[PDB]
Design an enzyme around this catalytic site. Sequence first.
Site, PDB file in Angstrom:
ATOM      1  N   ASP A  81     -42.542 -35.236   6.298  1.00 19.78           N
ATOM      2  CA  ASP A  81     -41.333 -34.502   6.647  1.00 19.78           C
ATOM      3  C   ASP A  81     -40.898 -33.429   5.649  1.00 19.78           C
ATOM      4  O   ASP A  81     -40.284 -33.739   4.624  1.00 19.78           O
ATOM      5  CB  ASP A  81     -40.226 -35.537   6.828  1.00 19.78           C
ATOM      6  CG  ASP A  81     -38.949 -34.954   7.375  1.00 19.78           C
ATOM      7  OD1 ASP A  81     -38.875 -33.726   7.562  1.00 19.78           O
ATOM      8  OD2 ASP A  81     -38.020 -35.745   7.617  1.00 19.78           O
ATOM      9  N   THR A  82     -41.189 -32.172   5.981  1.00 24.09           N
ATOM     10  CA  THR A  82     -40.856 -31.034   5.136  1.00 24.09           C
ATOM     11  C   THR A  82     -39.345 -30.781   5.087  1.00 24.09           C
ATOM     12  O   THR A  82     -38.846 -30.098   4.181  1.00 24.09           O
ATOM     13  CB  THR A  82     -41.573 -29.754   5.622  1.00 24.09           C
ATOM     14  OG1 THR A  82     -41.183 -29.453   6.975  1.00 24.09           O
ATOM     15  CG2 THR A  82     -43.083 -29.939   5.555  1.00 24.09           C
ATOM     16  N   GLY A  83     -38.625 -31.341   6.052  1.00 25.75           N
ATOM     17  CA  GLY A  83     -37.180 -31.191   6.093  1.00 25.75           C
ATOM     18  C   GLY A  83     -36.463 -32.222   5.225  1.00 25.75           C
ATOM     19  O   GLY A  83     -35.247 -32.200   5.102  1.00 25.75           O
TER      20      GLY A  83
HETATM   21  C1  LIG Z   1     -31.764 -34.049   2.272  1.00 25.71           C
HETATM   22  O1  LIG Z   1     -32.934 -34.865   2.200  1.00 25.71           O
HETATM   23  C2  LIG Z   1     -33.224 -35.726   3.291  1.00 25.71           C
HETATM   24  C3  LIG Z   1     -32.613 -35.613   4.593  1.00 25.71           C
HETATM   25  C4  LIG Z   1     -32.956 -36.511   5.634  1.00 25.71           C
HETATM   26  C5  LIG Z   1     -32.279 -36.365   6.971  1.00 25.71           C
HETATM   27  N1  LIG Z   1     -32.938 -35.671   8.126  1.00 25.71           N
HETATM   28  C6  LIG Z   1     -32.525 -36.127   9.373  1.00 25.71           C
HETATM   29  O2  LIG Z   1     -31.357 -36.514   9.513  1.00 25.71           O
HETATM   30  N2  LIG Z   1     -33.393 -36.164  10.456  1.00 25.71           N
HETATM   31  C7  LIG Z   1     -32.761 -36.171  11.807  1.00 25.71           C
HETATM   32  C8  LIG Z   1     -33.358 -35.317  12.872  1.00 25.71           C
HETATM   33  C9  LIG Z   1     -32.992 -33.956  12.967  1.00 25.71           C
HETATM   34  C10 LIG Z   1     -33.548 -33.140  13.980  1.00 25.71           C
HETATM   35  C11 LIG Z   1     -34.469 -33.688  14.893  1.00 25.71           C
HETATM   36  O3  LIG Z   1     -34.992 -32.872  15.876  1.00 25.71           O
HETATM   37  C12 LIG Z   1     -34.861 -35.060  14.815  1.00 25.71           C
HETATM   38  O4  LIG Z   1     -35.787 -35.518  15.766  1.00 25.71           O
HETATM   39  C13 LIG Z   1     -36.506 -36.711  15.478  1.00 25.71           C
HETATM   40  C14 LIG Z   1     -34.284 -35.869  13.783  1.00 25.71           C
HETATM   41  N3  LIG Z   1     -34.663 -36.267  10.311  1.00 25.71           N
HETATM   42  C15 LIG Z   1     -35.148 -37.584  10.406  1.00 25.71           C
HETATM   43  O5  LIG Z   1     -34.353 -38.508  10.205  1.00 25.71           O
HETATM   44  C16 LIG Z   1     -36.635 -37.997  10.740  1.00 25.71           C
HETATM   45  C17 LIG Z   1     -36.626 -39.467  11.319  1.00 25.71           C
HETATM   46  C18 LIG Z   1     -36.564 -39.885  12.787  1.00 25.71           C
HETATM   47  C19 LIG Z   1     -37.680 -40.139  13.626  1.00 25.71           C
HETATM   48  C20 LIG Z   1     -37.494 -40.530  14.991  1.00 25.71           C
HETATM   49  C21 LIG Z   1     -36.189 -40.669  15.519  1.00 25.71           C
HETATM   50  O6  LIG Z   1     -35.984 -41.046  16.833  1.00 25.71           O
HETATM   51  C22 LIG Z   1     -35.073 -40.422  14.703  1.00 25.71           C
HETATM   52  C23 LIG Z   1     -35.257 -40.034  13.352  1.00 25.71           C
HETATM   53  C24 LIG Z   1     -35.433 -35.066  10.011  1.00 25.71           C
HETATM   54  C25 LIG Z   1     -35.332 -34.796   8.494  1.00 25.71           C
HETATM   55  O7  LIG Z   1     -36.110 -33.667   8.236  1.00 25.71           O
HETATM   56  C26 LIG Z   1     -33.897 -34.525   7.903  1.00 25.71           C
HETATM   57  C27 LIG Z   1     -33.315 -33.163   8.403  1.00 25.71           C
HETATM   58  C28 LIG Z   1     -31.946 -32.851   7.840  1.00 25.71           C
HETATM   59  C29 LIG Z   1     -31.808 -32.227   6.566  1.00 25.71           C
HETATM   60  C30 LIG Z   1     -30.526 -31.940   6.025  1.00 25.71           C
HETATM   61  C31 LIG Z   1     -29.366 -32.280   6.759  1.00 25.71           C
HETATM   62  C32 LIG Z   1     -29.489 -32.898   8.025  1.00 25.71           C
HETATM   63  C33 LIG Z   1     -30.771 -33.182   8.562  1.00 25.71           C
HETATM   64  C34 LIG Z   1     -33.898 -37.519   5.402  1.00 25.71           C
HETATM   65  C35 LIG Z   1     -34.513 -37.647   4.124  1.00 25.71           C
HETATM   66  C36 LIG Z   1     -34.167 -36.750   3.088  1.00 25.71           C
HETATM   67  O8  LIG Z   1     -34.778 -36.896   1.854  1.00 25.71           O
END
Ligand SMILES: COc1cc(CN2C(=O)N(Cc3ccc(O)c(OC)c3)N(C(=O)CCc3ccc(O)cc3)C[C@@H](O)[C@H]2Cc2ccccc2)ccc1O
EC number: 3.4.23.16
Lengths: 99, 99
Positions: free
Chosen positions: B25-27
Amino acid sequence: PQITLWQRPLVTIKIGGQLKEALLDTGADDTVLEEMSLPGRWKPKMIGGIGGFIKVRQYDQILIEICGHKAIGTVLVGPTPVNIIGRNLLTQIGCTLNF
Amino acid sequence: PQITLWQRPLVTIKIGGQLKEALLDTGADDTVLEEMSLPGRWKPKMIGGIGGFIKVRQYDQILIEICGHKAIGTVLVGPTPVNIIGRNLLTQIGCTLNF
Ligand SMILES: COc1cc(CN2C(=O)N(Cc3ccc(O)c(OC)c3)N(C(=O)CCc3ccc(O)cc3)C[C@@H](O)[C@H]2Cc2ccccc2)ccc1O
């Protein structure tokens, strides 16, 4: 281009005649942007992850330009703390992870 | 290797001698794994996500193998939806985004 991950992979995007900064997120299934207006009809959707879920508006077939690369796809609009470019649009610009 | 994004970039990781499935996860700034046991003392850490924040346990200098590539860095443990491999370790294995 080749983007390292020492810093968050932020890029400028052009959507709805507006310019915005967004995060290239391989861990996101969908693209979700902060509150904004978009054309066409929409469907309510709930997306979740760290911290829980937020309610968004789902717009389909939306044109977006990322790093000069044009793409079309679904865009979710809601109270996200950061603009996110998900896999649904990363695929269209031919983005891949390499190591 | 080169990983396309038509599907979630899920790979196998090994930590504490056990295999687990995780998301490249690059995000994500950090690596966060579902509840498990790790050695040493831990420090408090809060991660902000799409739905808000969560509290996690921070462990440093933890050995972890990602898709066969060995790494040693900070691993966070808490109530995350899926095991997440974030930028702190993606940079260690030499992973970049390309398009
Ligand atoms: C800041 O460091 C971290 C942040 C996260 C939280 N996170 C997030 O809040 N999510 C939620 C999310 C967002 C958009 C989507 O289209 C999505 O679809 C699956 C999910 N992610 C995730 O949690 C990936 C996990 C996942 C997989 C399947 C599912 O059904 C739900 C969630 C993706 C992560 O990259 C990421 C994106 C993000 C970044 C900053 C502020 C808010 C969100 C995390 C770690 C950090 O170090």
